[PDB]
Structure formats: C-alpha cells, structure tokens
Design a binder for this molecule. Structure first.
Ligand SMILES: *[C@@H]1O[C@H](CO)[C@@H](O[C@@H]2O[C@H](CO)[C@@H](O)[C@H](O)[C@H]2NC(C)=O)[C@H](O)[C@H]1NC(C)=O
Ligand SMILES: *[C@@H]1O[C@H](CO)[C@@H](O[C@@H]2O[C@H](CO)[C@@H](O)[C@H](O)[C@H]2NC(C)=O)[C@H](O)[C@H]1NC(C)=O
Ligand SMILES: *[C@@H]1O[C@H](CO)[C@@H](O[C@@H]2O[C@H](CO)[C@@H](O)[C@H](O)[C@H]2NC(C)=O)[C@H](O)[C@H]1NC(C)=O
Ligand SMILES: *[C@@H]1O[C@H](CO)[C@@H](O[C@@H]2O[C@H](CO)[C@@H](O)[C@H](O)[C@H]2NC(C)=O)[C@H](O)[C@H]1NC(C)=O
Ligand SMILES: *[C@@H]1O[C@H](CO)[C@@H](O[C@@H]2O[C@H](CO)[C@@H](O)[C@H](O)[C@H]2NC(C)=O)[C@H](O)[C@H]1NC(C)=O
Ligand SMILES: *[C@@H]1O[C@H](CO)[C@@H](O[C@@H]2O[C@H](CO)[C@@H](O)[C@H](O)[C@H]2NC(C)=O)[C@H](O)[C@H]1NC(C)=O
Ligand SMILES: *[C@@H]1O[C@H](CO)[C@@H](O[C@@H]2O[C@H](CO)[C@@H](O)[C@H](O)[C@H]2NC(C)=O)[C@H](O)[C@H]1NC(C)=O
Ligand SMILES: *[C@@H]1O[C@H](CO)[C@@H](O)[C@H](O)[C@H]1NC(C)=O
Ligand SMILES: *[C@@H]1O[C@H](CO)[C@@H](O)[C@H](O)[C@H]1NC(C)=O
Ligand SMILES: *[C@@H]1O[C@H](CO)[C@@H](O)[C@H](O)[C@H]1NC(C)=O
Ligand SMILES: *[C@@H]1O[C@H](CO)[C@@H](O)[C@H](O)[C@H]1NC(C)=O
Ligand SMILES: *[C@@H]1O[C@H](CO)[C@@H](O)[C@H](O)[C@H]1NC(C)=O
Ligand SMILES: *[C@@H]1O[C@H](CO)[C@@H](O)[C@H](O)[C@H]1NC(C)=O
Ligand SMILES: *[C@@H]1O[C@H](CO)[C@@H](O)[C@H](O)[C@H]1NC(C)=O
Lengths: 196, 153, 218, 164
C-alpha cells in the first residue's frame, strides 16, 4: 500500500488537472472555440481572461502539490539510501532500523518506484527461570565476569553469555579480580576453579 | 469578487498547513527514531541521546509532543599523567589489550580510559608484537609474570 | 570561553571521577486536526452562491482531500512513536531497584489521571464558519499508558523487550551493561552503587525544578 | 439565556475573532447568547461489501438529540451498538473509540485495546536467559521515485489559438 499511494496520488492529481479544463470559471463557455465563434473579438478579451485565471490557478495548485510530494518522496529516498548503506552494506548497531530484533543482514529487492528490504533478524525464543548474582566472593577477592553473567540453576553457579544459554565453569580465565567482597551488594559465596 | 478573495485565503491556508505538516512529521520521524534508539537500547552515536556518554533514557508524554529524559555519563575530575605507546622488554614490545599505559612519576600502570583504576602491567592484559626499535616513544619497564613465582616454589 | 589545554607527546588526561547527568529533550509529535468546508466558509446559507461555486469545478474537492491527508497522518505520527511496543508492561509494587528511585517518572495511582509527577506539570504549562476540530485517535490517557508500558519495560527488562521477548534483570545489574557499552568495566558501578543511585535521584529531581523555573523550556 | 455583565450602554458582543456572540434584546433588559447552529460532517462506517452491506453513520461534532444511538466524543453513532469489553482497533473513529464487525452479526463500538497485559516477574536476584532463538525475516517497503511529468502552458491553457 505504500507504493500504491504514490501511483494513485499522482494519477488522481493529473485527472483533476484535465477536469479543470471543463470549468467555466465565470465565463460563458468552458470550451475555447465557442467563445470566439459566438462573441465579437473587440469584447471577447474579457471572456478569455476569465478562463486564463482559472486555468493558471489549476497549474499553480498542481505544481505546488507536486513540490510537496517531491519532498515526501525524497525524504523516503534519502531514507532508502541510508537503509541500503547500513542494513545491506553492513551490520547496524541501531535498534529497530533494520527490522524488529537483533539485525544480522538484509537483502534488497527492486520494486516499481520503490525498494523492498528483506531484513533478517535474530529473535530469542525460549527462556526460563534463573538466579543471578552481581559477583562472587573468594579468599579476600571479588570476581566479576568479563563478557558473561553469573547464573544459578538452584544448586550450582555458572557463567554464560546473555543472548544464549551456554553455561561454563567459573574459572580465572573468564573472570577478573577487583577488590574484596564487602562493598558489592548482593555478592554470593562460591569457589573459583583454578585451571593451573 | 468575494469568491476569488476567499478561495485564495483557503489556498494559502492549506498550503501553509502542508508546509507545517512536513515539519511536524520530520520531527515525528525523528521522535520515532529517538525512542527506538535511546529508550529501546543504548546508542553508540554521539550527541543523539544527550550530551555525554549515553546510558539510558526515559520517555515522558506531553501534549502534542514527547519529552525525553536522557541519562548521560559525564566525566568529572581528571589530573596529570604521563603516557607511553608501549613498553619494551627482553627483546619484546608489550601493547595493552583494552587499556592505556600511564605513569604517576615513578611507576608505570595500566588502566582503562574512561576511569582511573590502575593495575600491575602483567602478561594477561598485554600482548607481545615485535621488538622495541620500531615504535617511537617506547619506554623501559618490567612486566610481572604471574606464573614465574609458581615455578620457583 | 578561551581554553588552551596542555598538549604533549607523552602526556594524557584520565578522569578519576564522573557525574551522572540527566538532560531534557522535547520533540513535537502531532498537530491539531482541522477540517474546513467550502460550502459554509465561503458562503453559508446562500443558495445563489453555491450555484456560482460549481463553475470553478473541483477546487474544493482536492482542498478537503489535502486537509484529510494531514489529519489522517497526525494520528499516524503518534503510532510509530508511542506504540513501538505491542504489549503493556507493569511495574511491580515492590520498588526495590537497588537504591534507584523512579517516583517522578512512574505513574501515580492516587490521581484520577494515571500520570507521572513530571507529566503532571508538563500538561499544566500548555494551554465557526465551517471550522471544526477533530479529536485525536489516541486520548491523553492512552499515550500515558503507552509511556508507562515503555517505562516498565526499560527498568525491568532494558533493551530485551524491544528485540524480542521481555527478559527480567535487576536494575542494579543491567546498569553495568550500560557501563560496558561506553568502555567502563562492571566494577565501577558496584563499587559506587550508592553514589550513582544518589546522583541519579538528585538529577531526576532537578528536572522538575528546571522545567518549572522558566516557561521558555517548553 | 446568559449570565453576562453587559454595560447599560452596550448592546453588541464580540469575541477575539470578531463574531457576534451575545446581543441584547432591545425591549427587555436581558442578555442572550448566540452560538452557531450545530453542524458537522457525515461519516459512514462500513466493513467490506463482500462481507456485509450494513453501515454505521457517524454524525461528527453534534449532540444528536436534535437530529442504536451511542454518544461519543467525536459525535455519535447510529446503527452501531456499544459493548463493555475492549477489542483491537481496525476502523478508527476518534477519542479511543473504534468500530468493528463482530458478534447474528452487527457493528459494535468499543474502547481501544492498547495491547496484551503482561506482568513480568521482577526480582533483585532473578534473570531470564534465552535457551533458543528464531531467525525472522521481515519485509520493509520504501518508495524511491515519482513519475516524471511535464506540463506546457502553451498547449494546456489554450491550444491552437493564436489570439490567446
Ligand atoms: C544444575 O546443573 C548442574 C550441572 O549440570 C547439575 O549437576 C549435575 O547434575 C546431574 C544430574 O543430571 C548429576 O548427574 C551430576 O553428577 C551433577 N554434577 C555434579 C558436579 O554434581 C545440577 O544437578 C543442577 N541442579 C538442578 C537443581 O537442576
Ligand atoms: C562468605 O564466606 C565468608 C567467610 O568464608 C563469610 O565471612 C564470615 O562472616 C561471619 C558472619 O558475617 C563472620 O562471623 C566471620 O568472621 C566471617 N569470616 C571471615 C573469614 O571474614 C561471609 O559472611 C560469607 N558470605 C555469605 C553471603 O554467606
Ligand atoms: C605512584 O604510585 C605508586 C603505587 O601506589 C606509589 O608507590 C607506593 O607509594 C606509597 C606511598 O604512599 C609507598 O608506601 C609504597 O611503598 C609504594 N609502593 C612501592 C611498590 O614502592 C608511588 O609512590 C607513586 N609515586 C608518586 C610520585 O606519587
Ligand atoms: C632499554 O634497555 C635496553 C637494554 O636494557 C637499552 O638498549 C641499550 O642501548 C644502549 C644505547 O642505546 C646500547 O649501548 C646497548 O647496547 C643497548 N643494549 C641492548 C641489550 O640492546 C635501551 O636503550 C633502553 N631504552 C631506553 C629508552 O632507555
Ligand atoms: C566523586 O564525586 C562525588 C560527587 O560527585 C564525591 O561524593 C562526595 O564526596 C564528599 C566527600 O566528603 C561528600 O561530602 C559528598 O557528600 C559526596 N557527594 C555525594 C552526592 O554523595 C566522591 O567523593 C568523588 N570521589 C572521588 C574519588 O573523588
Ligand atoms: C523517591 O523520591 C520521592 C521524592 O522525589 C520520595 O518522596 C518523599 O518521601 C519522603 C519520605 O519517604 C517524604 O517526607 C517526602 O515528602 C516525599 N516527597 C515527595 C515529593 O513526595 C520517595 O520516598 C522516594 N522513594 C523512596 C523509595 O524513597
Ligand atoms: C530450538 O528451536 C528449534 C525450532 O525453532 C527446535 O528445532 C525443532 O526440534 C524439534 C524436536 O523434536 C523437531 O521436531 C523440529 O523439526 C525442529 N524444527 C526444525 C525447524 O528443525 C530445536 O529443537 C530447539 N532447541 C532446543 C534446545 O530447544
Ligand atoms: C522463575 O523462578 C524464580 C524462582 O525459582 C522466580 O523468582 C521467578 O519469578 C520465576 N519466573 C517466572 C517467569 O515464572
Ligand atoms: C533482595 O530482595 C529480598 C526481598 O525480595 C531481600 O530480602 C534481600 O535482602 C534483597 N537483597 C539485596 C542484595 O538487595
Ligand atoms: C600535568 O603535568 C604534566 C607534567 O607533570 C604537564 O606536562 C602537563 O602540562 C600538566 N597538565 C596540566 C593540565 O596542568
Ligand atoms: C617528545 O617531545 C619532546 C619535546 O617536547 C622531545 O624532546 C622528545 O624527543 C619527543 N619524543 C618523541 C617520542 O617524539
Ligand atoms: C413597552 O411599552 C409598553 C407601553 O405600550 C409597556 O407596557 C411595556 O412594559 C414596555 N416594555 C418594556 C420591556 O418596558
Ligand atoms: C447533549 O444533550 C443532553 C441533553 O439531553 C445533555 O445531557 C448532554 O450533556 C449533551 N452532551 C454534550 C456533550 O453536551
Ligand atoms: C455495560 O456496562 C454497564 C455498567 O457499567 C451496563 O449498564 C450496560 O448495560 C452494559 N452494556 C452492555 C451492552 O452490556
């Protein structure tokens, strides 16, 4: 329907301009040839100028309405050039610019007086209950995850990424030590497995 | 005479309304972009969700408008530091992974750029790339191995 | 102000502190829906003029069509702005957000109109020859319910509700991931959780004072 | 009947837009307001003609006791009943009221449903992590160009006439 409105608004405004040629505009006849054939040329100039003012105002309305719709189309055309530069030619960090969800890639499709984008997105499906803690205390040390989150399934604590469930053993490789464990609110007690 | 004057008043009013409709819709298209990027996520773009490093923002409904409360991160207190691009070693050059080498006058330390939190320059947070005769401005300092005292035990 | 920052080939500047700042950005959304009829504006109650108006043709057929296209897009402009979310999220009654206070932006159930205190003074500072005013598609209470759904989806879920299903996360923990997006590690938030929450509460309350300080902000 | 405070020498009354609002009747010392006679557009609310031929007439911006009948803030509805439950909007009317064709079938009027009510469980030590995902492909359509049209004043206004 977005491409249907551009064809419909341009064709209906054109048919309005043709319909303005059948208007009298206060004159005797809308058709020009019957004015000359029935009125004398010394006083026909009054009847001619009634048709000129009405027909020029139809063109002045049509050109002004076309310049309004030209700015609307060019704003979408400037948007469509931005979409192909950012969604097709790369991966966009912006949210809801290349579809709903985490953007992976997109494909262009040529359309009559338009462009169709096929935004391939990443949408999470199945989540469940988890118990989390901001950090884990140790022997005088507090351990924070590098790029993960501390989660628990009820008995054991694990570290995993945020966009997918893939638990791992909390070791010193994926955690970094920053201070002790009396400042961070909500810190829990668990061991950290040394791989050395 | 009255019809031509009154129709020109309507033709001026409709044309002026269509001009202001495009100005409002441009702001409405901007406001839809702001809520999609500042409210529904964190924006990497600078000065799009307030002045400073953007953290989050909150919408507020307004009569014929929208009010955004952009929560930003602004640094406050900085002081003097001495920096070097890298640190040479026994035939090796050490570059920081996600930090910057700084000195307080006597000792060299590694810390992040947006906050001061110095750490001991070790092999965990540094990577070795070549020797130390190509990088201009490299200084001489030791790199503490966190595995060497375990070998001597 | 003239500033000459000291530049050197071995000198750097690193902030040892920070300041949480809340700024106010105002953007218009929609106009007022207005429809004008040529039958009553140009010449009302006169049957000798409407016969003369038919000689001009269809000047006013496209004139009311242009104003209808303006009014149908004023209601459309609210749709892509305030109705970005499909579901309505509710804040839980236990306001335990790790010291963070959202009472100025959360709606107040005591008032007959469920609006936030910041939204309360925003509305207070803003005030027939064929002329009519069409009411908008969405009422002021429905826009406020759209705002409360997005506010509850940001404190509880964050950005997860806009990219899929809403995933719960504490506000004291998802604020660290906002710190990671600007290059700050997670330990800075947890070592200064009382200071950041006090800075956020003071900056939110200064918005209500700054909005009522001058009428030129709106 | 009005409760205005006209001066004893004052007879006419105008607003900011110079429209007569209150004039005295010249015999009795009385004040009478003048509001214009009520007018508005006529809007027909219908489903598709392949579905049904029943229509609902919306008389905009009028108290239609002067002209089922349900009074709204956009006027009133004729032929459309009012229901207490709220559904999704498909045919907009205004002020949070939308008409539809549901339930032996008749046009109903209701308040807009803004969405499904969701109360996600929030806690200070509870998180939600997706164990799966779904690859979704969405279609976005954007117009690019208009139709190139050129109009000449020599032929459109008056063709073949050298006197014009
Ligand atoms: C939480 O996850 C851990 C890791 O899988 C579970 O521990 C194992 O559970 C299985 C039962 O299927 C046992 O056979 C293993 O011996 C367990 N491993 C260890 C090291 O004990 C744990 O049971 C899970 N807890 C809950 C409540 O589901
Ligand atoms: C985590 O473990 C530490 C020690 O293993 C706990 O610290 C003890 O806390 C009790 C009561 O607060 C004191 O009486 C002890 O003297 C503390 N021991 C030490 C070595 O400091 C700490 O409370 C535990 N945390 C949690 C949440 O259980
Ligand atoms: C630069 O920072 C280092 C690290 O803190 C300082 O070294 C320590 O300084 C304190 C003085 O408050 C001494 O008590 C410690 O013994 C020092 N540590 C070592 C390993 O020697 C250093 O003094 C700072 N330099 C300057 C100029 O401020
Ligand atoms: C860092 O230390 C190395 C060696 O520890 C220095 O290299 C020496 O430089 C001098 C003069 O340039 C030479 O005479 C030596 O033969 C070099 N030694 C070696 C082992 O190559 C280097 O100059 C030091 N860099 C700085 C900036 O002081
Ligand atoms: C960083 O800045 C904050 C304020 O922006 C400092 O917090 C203040 O500390 C002083 C110390 O006496 C207190 O009197 C104030 O009440 C604190 N303000 C608030 C709002 O709590 C903080 O101390 C600074 N930190 C550093 C390391 O300089
Ligand atoms: C959030 O902030 C508001 C004020 O902005 C707090 O409301 C105040 O509460 C105290 C006592 O709790 C009263 O003495 C004040 O009169 C209240 N002020 C206003 C303007 O209402 C509110 O308590 C804060 N939230 C929490 C959980 O503390
Ligand atoms: C994640 O979701 C996908 C589908 O979205 C699951 O794949 C289906 O698995 C069932 C298991 O019996 C099969 O019958 C279907 O044919 C699979 N669908 C497709 C399209 O192949 C997948 O099993 C889910 N994974 C988890 C761990 O829940
Ligand atoms: C999941 O379970 C935890 C406790 O096990 C509970 O606190 C939380 O509310 C549950 N979430 C949902 C969505 O049921
Ligand atoms: C978390 O909330 C519970 C009650 O819901 C409370 O008992 C507990 O102390 C809280 N923990 C923290 C770290 O705030
Ligand atoms: C900070 O001190 C260094 C030397 O210690 C100097 O080079 C630099 O210009 C100083 N910067 C400022 C802002 O004073
Ligand atoms: C840095 O600048 C100083 C003078 O300001 C100069 O002596 C020194 O050689 C320079 N070092 C480098 C690595 O360019
Ligand atoms: C008008 O004049 C008549 C006298 O013929 C008098 O009876 C009547 O009261 C007058 N009306 C008013 C409103 O004074
Ligand atoms: C319409 O008229 C009735 C009188 O029967 C009145 O009660 C009602 O308030 C009027 N409605 C409006 C919107 O003025
Ligand atoms: C709707 O509910 C009201 C009470 O709130 C009742 O008077 C009215 O009859 C109901 N209408 C229908 C159609 O059930």
């Amino acid at each position: 329907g977005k491409l249907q409105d551009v064809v419909n608004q341009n064709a209906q405004a054109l048919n309005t301009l043709v319909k303005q040629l059948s208007s009298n505009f206060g004159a005797i006849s809308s058709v020009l040839n019957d004015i000359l054939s029935r009125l004398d040329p010394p006083e026909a100039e009054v009847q001619i100028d009634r048709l000129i003012t009405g027909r020029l105002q139809s063109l002045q309305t049509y050109v002004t309405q076309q310049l309004i719709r030209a700015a609307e189309i060019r704003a979408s055309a400037n948007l469509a050039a931005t979409k192909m530069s950012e969604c097709v030619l790369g991966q966009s960090k912006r949210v809801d610019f290349c579809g709903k969800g985490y953007h992976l890639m997109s494909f262009p499709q040529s359309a009559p007086h338009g462009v169709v984008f096929l935004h391939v997105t990443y949408v999470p499906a199945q989540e469940k209950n988890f118990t989390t803690a901001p950090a884990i205390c140790h022997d005088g040390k507090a351990h924070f995850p590098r790029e993960g989150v501390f989660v628990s399934n009820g008995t054991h604590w694990f570290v995993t990424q945020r966009n997918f469930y893939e638990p791992q053993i909390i070791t010193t490789d994926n955690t970094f030590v920053s201070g002790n464990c009396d400042v961070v609110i909500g810190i829990v007690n668990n061991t950290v497995y040394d791989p050395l | 005479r009255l019809i031509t004057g009154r129709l020109q008043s309507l033709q001026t009013y409709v044309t002026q309304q269509l001009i202001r409709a495009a100005e409002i819709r441009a702001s409405a298209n901007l406001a839809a972009t702001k809520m999609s990027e500042c409210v529904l996520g964190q924006s990497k773009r600078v000065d799009f969700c307030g002045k400073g490093y953007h953290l989050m923002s909150f919408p507020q409904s307004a009569p014929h408008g929208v009010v955004f409360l952009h929560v930003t991160y602004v640094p406050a207190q900085e002081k003097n530091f001495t920096t070097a691009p890298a640190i040479c070693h026994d035939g090796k050059a050490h570059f920081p992974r996600e930090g910057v080498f700084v000195s307080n006058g006597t000792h060299w330390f590694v810390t992040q750029r947006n906050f001061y939190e110095p750490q001991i320059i070790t092999t965990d947070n540094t990577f070795v790339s070549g020797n130390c005769d190509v990088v201009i401005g490299i200084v001489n300092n030791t790199v503490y191995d966190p595995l060497q005292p375990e070998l001597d035990s | 102000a003239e500033n000459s920052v000291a530049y050197s080939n071995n000198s750097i500047a690193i902030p040892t502190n920070f300041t949480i700042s809340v700024t106010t950005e105002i953007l218009p959304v929609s106009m007022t829906k207005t429809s004008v009829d040529c039958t009553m504006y140009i010449c009302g109650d006169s049957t000798e003029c409407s016969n003369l108006l038919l000689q001009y043709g269809s000047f006013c057929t496209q004139l009311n069509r242009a104003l209808t296209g303006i009014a149908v897009e004023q209601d459309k402009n609210t749709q892509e702005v305030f109705a970005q979310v499909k579901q309505i999220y509710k804040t839980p009654p236990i306001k335990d957000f790790g010291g963070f206070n959202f009472s100025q932006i959360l709606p107040d159930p005591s008032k007959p109109s469920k609006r936030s205190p910041i939204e309360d003074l925003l509305f207070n500072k803003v005030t027939f020859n064929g002329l009519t005013v069409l009411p908008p598609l969405l009422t002021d209470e429905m826009i406020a319910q759209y705002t409360s759904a997005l506010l509850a989806g940001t404190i509880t879920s964050g950005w997860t509700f806009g990219a899929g299903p809403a995933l719960q996360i504490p506000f004291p923990m998802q604020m660290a991931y906002r710190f990671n997006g600007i290059g700050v590690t997670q330990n800075v938030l947890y070592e200064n959780q009382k200071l950041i929450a006090n800075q956020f509460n003071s900056a939110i309350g200064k918005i209500q004072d700054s909005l009522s300080s001058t009428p030129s902000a709106l | 009947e009005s409760n205005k405070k006209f001066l004893p020498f004052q007879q006419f009354g105008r607003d900011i837009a110079d429209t007569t609002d209150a004039v005295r009747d010249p015999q009795t010392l009385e004040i009478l307001d003048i509001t214009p006679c009520s007018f508005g557009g006529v809007s027909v609310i219908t489903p598709g003609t392949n579905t049904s031929n029943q229509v609902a007439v919306l008389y905009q911006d009028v108290n239609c006791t002067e002209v089922n009948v349900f009074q709204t803030r956009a006027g009133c509805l004729i032929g459309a009943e009012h229901v207490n439950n709220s559904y999704e909007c498909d045919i907009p009317i205004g002020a949070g009221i939308c008409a539809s064709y549901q339930t032996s079938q008749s046009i109903i009027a209701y308040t807009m449903s803004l969405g499904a009510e969701n109360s996600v469980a929030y806690s200070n030590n509870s998180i939600a992590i997706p164990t799966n995902f779904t690859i979704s492909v969405t279609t976005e359509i954007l117009p690019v160009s208009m139709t190139k049209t050129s109009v000449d004043c020599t032929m459109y206004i008056c063709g073949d006439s050298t006197e014009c």
